Write a protein that binds this ligand. Structure first.
Ligand SMILES: NC(=O)c1ccc[n+]([C@@H]2O[C@H](COP(=O)([O-])OP(=O)(O)OC[C@H]3O[C@@H](n4cnc5c(N)ncnc54)[C@H](O)[C@@H]3O)[C@@H](O)[C@H]2O)c1
Ligand SMILES: NC(=O)c1ccc[n+]([C@@H]2O[C@H](COP(=O)([O-])OP(=O)(O)OC[C@H]3O[C@@H](n4cnc5c(N)ncnc54)[C@H](O)[C@@H]3O)[C@@H](O)[C@H]2O)c1
Ligand SMILES: NC(=O)c1ccc[n+]([C@@H]2O[C@H](COP(=O)([O-])OP(=O)(O)OC[C@H]3O[C@@H](n4cnc5c(N)ncnc54)[C@H](O)[C@@H]3O)[C@@H](O)[C@H]2O)c1
Lengths: 363, 357, 360
């Protein structure tokens, strides 16, 4: 064995509760957390009564959770504009830090927290846990062996027909900075680049729509109940067009509300010189799908996942994301999600937003 | 009317936790348990939620327990004969698991030991009590297939080696997937045909993917150490019976076929045909009759039952009631002995020759 | 320009009018016929449709062979004559294309190879389903070892109820067997060909005479009724063929059996690295081919994609490949030695009317 890892958690809510806390508990052999911050201390204490170890810290404001020099790693499950604050310099006053999903809504703040990190000495990672799904790994591994050839056309799918989240921070334009483009669209673009392993941006064009978000009959049909139409501060959909310096191109579609039929998110579509591939996931897909396509021995074929069943008496990615995170600081290696990659992601989404000036942004 | 049978389970591992204990609890009105496993914490943990019952690590100490009236042996296959025979049939009714034993002659000793006892004996062939298997069984007993001359036994998994115990230890199991899941399919097949007159047996045993480095990739039950794969990964047989009927058999834990169909049978008759579908490629067990009717080819299948707002339990209940009321359990030991005889003859084609009966 | 090969047809029967005549007119630039059929009005009518000017129409094959103007002979008589019309004769000046099974007899077959080697001429057998695009796809992938070593295979030649009620197939005199040599030939040829294993060590089979003479057997037959009182041949058979490298091949063949899946001219292969199966027959409106393997710790399957929109066969592919190999002096795809192993094994399965495994 080897001691343990003393974890500090900042912000206890939606994805501290649905992803982060269960992830750590199912790897308790490597972690146990005292932490339990939040501006609202009511929740902070409750978590530390379920997942906090034998007598622990429970601060009401982070600045002194970071004081305790026995905590060694921090999980920033803030909202988005606090993502910079609680992380940049603040947390790396002597810690490794796991910041959540959209690294930051701003590119400058993101560039600040990568330099605060590069002097940290410690380690850093972002919550793109979808990389750890078995089929995304499968596709990533395939593109690493060049079995798709060289990818010259990619698509990032992050579409929802009417699945606007009405339960938390995602609609406060000030707390998260943007709408579905940086909510879910950041997941799909991360995989697309990661498999293509192309991060050298040249140009960016985009369009941001504000159409169903303010229509009276807008919330009609939304999965998560109605929402106040006269208070929609973000967008309902956005579409992107990014050209790389090797010539490759990526199209992006992101939305919470749009009258399209195929709700496909956390997915991508790659087109190489030897083969292609597409991943399927979202509201219209009860099971995640992976389909290669190529010409083999002069016939067009397609290779997909086979249906896995159970036996008489015998028979995930959030846990795999987190476990790999701890063993990373433990054995002293690199986590899978690299900080510079999440940086490339946010600066393009930002660039797609900044095409709110109706002009293509060259990099 | 009748007081609960007092049960002692030897072996508190996999099949004991997910088949026997829930079934015994479902039929709690006919039984109560008074626990054994050489990893004693397994026995203690089971004695905590299913049991002031005995909790030992020596099986010999449990058959000494005079309060035990029925013993269930759910330890690996090699162990089956020692625990069951000259030991358990010391005034104890015995329910022995799935693979009677690995050897035709430890099995022949077990039967002999059972008949001396004057007690009750049966084997864990719970797949018989699936309603569609019962369905097929009733239809050939009625002869609605005619004479059955071709029967297929399906016991194939594409990639599902059991990795939670000792299934890959020839010293403790005696064999691989041939006697692990091929016994279920052969049991059903011969039981429906009511034929046990073996003429000849030709078989093959494959060692290909168990030790392959890439073998464990895609396994339902996590990876397996290729170094310590001491038994086969597939085997097929060809059995001829004296009435002219022929039985094909396919068994495997790992093989690159597409159709994972296990605990299933296919029967071609002179008047009609039928086939059972079950396994990892089937989210629902299926039963399909086929025949010509009014000069047109037809097929009869189970209709989709839904809602409005299992077989182990059925098997366990009829077992305890056979003991209580002094009747016959459904799976006769003679039937399970013919099966392992045929399975050992399939193996015994390590001599590259058709064993003849 | 290469001078057209002068073809002589022996047996102007059903296979000539469905396979050989339209193929030879589809490659009419490489050939021209110059027709023998004991039922002389068949040859005379065949010559009026596909013949070339003064064509030789006679009823004795030994006369056609004495035509100096013929150099390639297709033998499309029944199996009982597949040999003598091909051995001694035919291999007495000419190249010969003998039809589907080489012979019902094993030794009849081993002697037409000897007459072909002592000939210096070309020789191929009408196993034309090797030329279906999906069958070569599989053939190409195993040649490249992409399945690994194939240690277990299955040959599928099953029909639920499709006893051929026309032609010659029900006449045991002219064929020597039923579905085991009518369609089990095709299935086993493909299976051996992809495994590339023609080294037998054991054959165990069983032959069933059940629905064929049963009164209600003909009920629901796809081609119509047949009289069970005259039925001379089996309705199904199953075999268990072991090879020397250790591999195993099960085989299923039938015109009539009470199973659900009518799969014929198909194969299934399980290799050390991957597997594959082909689907063809009367339960398959379009041929299928499915590779199966593990790719990055996940089970996957690779199948042909649906082609459509049309615009804006294996019979003639087999024939051109055959004609060309003669002009260029190449060798045809179907090797005579391969076809010999096929009806050896099939004979060894039949030859379990001894209820004994016949070792090799
Ligand atoms: N699939 C994913 O990985 C995923 C999903 C949803 C959200 N996220 C990301 O995770 C973060 C938000 O997730 P959420 O849905 O749980 O939001 P949330 O509002 O439900 O949880 C955040 C909590 O932190 C508290 N908070 C606000 N400011 C704080 C501060 N300075 N210090 C301490 N606590 C503060 C709030 O009270 C709130 O309860 C964001 O960075 C978001 O973009 C990721
Ligand atoms: N669908 C079915 O019917 C089904 C399923 C699984 C297993 N089985 C059969 O049931 C048997 C047990 O297999 P399993 O799945 O439970 O794997 P398992 O290894 O988990 O169960 C065996 C347990 O018995 C214990 N054991 C070994 N030797 C012992 C001894 N002398 N005394 C006491 N305990 C001993 C082991 O510690 C183990 O916990 C096997 O013979 C197997 O073939 C049947
Ligand atoms: N898919 C295939 O490759 C396929 C299909 C059917 C038949 N075949 C093969 O082709 C042969 C049978 O052909 P068929 O189905 O057209 O039978 P068929 O009865 O329709 O035609 C055979 C003709 O040969 C003639 N014949 C018989 N003996 C002769 C002799 N000594 N001399 C000259 N002519 C003679 C007969 O007159 C008859 O017209 C067999 O070798 C059979 O196995 C192959």
């Amino acid at each position: 064995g080897m001691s343990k890892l003393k974890i500090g958690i900042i912000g206890c809510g939606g994805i501290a509760n649905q992803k982060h806390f269960p992830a750590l508990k199912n790897n308790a052999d490597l972690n146990e957390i005292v932490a339990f911050c939040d501006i609202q201390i009511d929740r902070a204490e409750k978590a530390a009564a379920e997942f906090g170890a034998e007598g622990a810290q429970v601060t009401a404001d982070y600045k002194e959770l970071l004081a305790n020099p026995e905590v060694e790693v921090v999980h920033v499950c803030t909202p988005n504009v606090s993502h910079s604050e609680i992380t940049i310099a603040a947390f790396e006053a002597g810690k490794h830090v796991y910041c959540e999903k959209p690294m930051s809504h701003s590119t400058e703040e993101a560039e600040k927290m990568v330099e605060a990190w590069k002097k940290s000495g410690k380690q850093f990672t972002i919550g793109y846990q979808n990389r750890f799904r078995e089929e995304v790994m499968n596709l990533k591994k395939s593109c690493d062996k060049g079995e798709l050839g060289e990818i010259y056309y990619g698509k990032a799918h992050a579409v929802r027909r009417r699945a606007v989240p009405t339960w938390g921070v995602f609609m406060d334009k000030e707390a998260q900075g943007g709408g579905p483009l940086i909510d879910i669209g950041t997941h799909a673009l991360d995989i697309t680049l990661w498999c293509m392993n192309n991060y050298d941006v040249d140009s960016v064009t985009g369009s941001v729509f504000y159409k169903l978000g303010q229509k009276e009959n807008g919330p009609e049909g939304n999965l998560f109940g109605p929402w106040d139409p006269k208070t929609f501060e973000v967008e309902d959909s956005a579409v992107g067009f990014v050209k790389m310096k090797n010539g490759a191109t990526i199209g992006l579609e992101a939305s919470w509300a749009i009258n399209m039929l195929d709700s496909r998110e956390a997915s991508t579509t790659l087109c190489g010189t030897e083969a292609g591939a597409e991943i399927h996931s979202g509201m219209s897909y009860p099971k995640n799908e992976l389909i290669y396509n190529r010409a083999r021995n002069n016939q067009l074929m397609e290779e997909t996942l086979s249906s896995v069943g159970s036996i008489a008496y015998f028979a995930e990615e959030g846990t795999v994301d987190n476990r790999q995170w701890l063993e990373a600081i433990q054995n002293g290696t690199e986590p899978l999600v690299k900080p510079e990659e999440a940086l490339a992601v946010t600066k393009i989404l930002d660039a797609i937003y900044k095409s709110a000036k109706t002009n293509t942004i060259k990099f």
